[PDB]
Design a protein around this ligand. Sequence first.
Ligand SMILES: CC(=O)N[C@H]1[C@H]([C@H](O)[C@H](O)CO)O[C@@](O)(C(=O)O)C[C@@H]1O
Ligand SMILES: CC(=O)N[C@H]1[C@H]([C@H](O)[C@H](O)CO)O[C@@](O)(C(=O)O)C[C@@H]1O
Ligand SMILES: CC(=O)N[C@H]1[C@H]([C@H](O)[C@H](O)CO)O[C@@](O)(C(=O)O)C[C@@H]1O
Lengths: 185, 185, 185
Amino acid sequence: RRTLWTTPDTSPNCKMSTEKDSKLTLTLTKCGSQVLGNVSLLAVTGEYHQMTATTKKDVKISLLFDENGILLPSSSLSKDYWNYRSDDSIVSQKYNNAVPFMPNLTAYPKPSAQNAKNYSRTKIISNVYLGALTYQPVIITIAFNQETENGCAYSITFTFTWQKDYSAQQFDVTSFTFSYLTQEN
Amino acid sequence: RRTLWTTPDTSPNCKMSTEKDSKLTLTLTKCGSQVLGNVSLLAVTGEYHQMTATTKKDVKISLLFDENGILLPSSSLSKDYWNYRSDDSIVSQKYNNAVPFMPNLTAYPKPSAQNAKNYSRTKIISNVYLGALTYQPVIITIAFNQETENGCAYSITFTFTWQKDYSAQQFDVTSFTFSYLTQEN
Amino acid sequence: RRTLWTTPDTSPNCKMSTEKDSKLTLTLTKCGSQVLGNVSLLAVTGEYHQMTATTKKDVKISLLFDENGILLPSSSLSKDYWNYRSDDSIVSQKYNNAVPFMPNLTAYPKPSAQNAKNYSRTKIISNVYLGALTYQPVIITIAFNQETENGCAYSITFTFTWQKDYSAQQFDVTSFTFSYLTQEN
Ligand SMILES: CC(=O)N[C@H]1[C@H]([C@H](O)[C@H](O)CO)O[C@@](O)(C(=O)O)C[C@@H]1O
Ligand SMILES: CC(=O)N[C@H]1[C@H]([C@H](O)[C@H](O)CO)O[C@@](O)(C(=O)O)C[C@@H]1O
Ligand SMILES: CC(=O)N[C@H]1[C@H]([C@H](O)[C@H](O)CO)O[C@@](O)(C(=O)O)C[C@@H]1O
């Protein structure tokens, strides 16, 4: 069908600090040339569930994909928790081609180490809000195809950075809508 | 078809302070698993048409829906002004099922009074701009399924909050794009 | 098909200061009642490729369309670089009707000179980031049908304004997602 997602439940599927300490809620809906994306992140256990003054205010969630658009196991997100939608769940077969969901490699080329400075269009930068409190911004940076980790063909990364002291709080952010150009259609 | 909307005209349809003092422009377009939403709000009469120093800088527009996805009459938005699109208008039959437009209850569960602190992913927080002037932010908070008013099955609320003194101005904001996960597909 | 775009390559197609000094990357995907848009801008040559302290911190990119939704040659964007998608390129026939991609004239009416103050819903205002650096905001203002230049039927303009001193840098911004109501469906 035309949605890849994590499912909308709260079962931990992602690494912020340690394995499966967090729930990434990510939905990618194919709209022709573009994917319409929706993302949020919640810490369920570990450091980011009850932050301290020294907790690093920078968290990168990496989704690395192979040439078939299939998630690599070195990704932050667990493979078992990511697939095509069926009802409120995911399909049973694990290895379904997803090239039409991948970010376009002409729009968003892989880095070349010389320039060490790619096109800014490879990123989206905005704010989401910790605890859904309007005075608690967290910068979200979405980057397309900027990883080289583990021979990936494509990548989507979500980086959350902040400056304010959110010690004693649970990391949880508002939802963010975005789009990107796809490899196929 | 695949759009629910208010129509794009300027005929008042909504309550900010009193009945039908304002035009909510809202379009919900079904894109599979997600709705693509577009919203703006204009005060046509009453307090928010010519604000004062004491006008409350917090306005909640509530859309409450029943189990069929049909707007409840206790909503801020008038029933008569909300339906499936036809041309630049709305269809003639008033009571059309709209469950596929409703926010997903697994992604966006109704509150349980104990925790008194739901998932932050149930909200979207950003800024729109009063008068389309870049120095006049208004915080927009969109919340999914967080109301319990009048036995609603689903809800979408738009809250506009601000801190700057917009006395002597008409409330009118720029358009805001968003998406959310739907109950069905 | 259902995408109008510039293509995702880096071949200059647009005027910031002089002809074809910049690459506008713009994709418009038809989703029923709405277009899902994605935009970014890069200066390849001229003033905006290496800004100075006096470079004007205001750049308007104008797309003017005729009654058939076809770009007028007085637009900032070159005609030769804009058309319906095929693969990663554009179709061969140059003059394809695109009314279903045009911004809705009821939602976004042309100005009437008296009020000299249209509906704020005709604009979207947010920030994108120069160099994809989180401390370098650039205000993006998208306006629908607000031009009268050259007898246009429709218009979409992208204005980039800023206040910080970005001297010695290349103008290049992060991607921005938006939507608008269309004339037809
Ligand atoms: C939605 C939004 O823009 N929130 C912003 C808030 C609000 O403007 C003020 O709390 C009240 O207006 O101000 C900040 O300085 C803050 O609190 O950290 C930045 C933050 O991004
Ligand atoms: C689009 C945007 O971000 N606008 C912001 C403006 C501009 O940054 C400055 O007016 C000029 O740069 O600054 C604010 O402090 C303001 O005016 O209230 C917050 C507001 O949200
Ligand atoms: C994504 C975002 O909101 N960036 C904002 C940054 C960051 O908040 C701080 O650099 C660190 O938090 O602050 C600004 O004052 C700035 O740098 O110009 C406004 C800018 O829009």
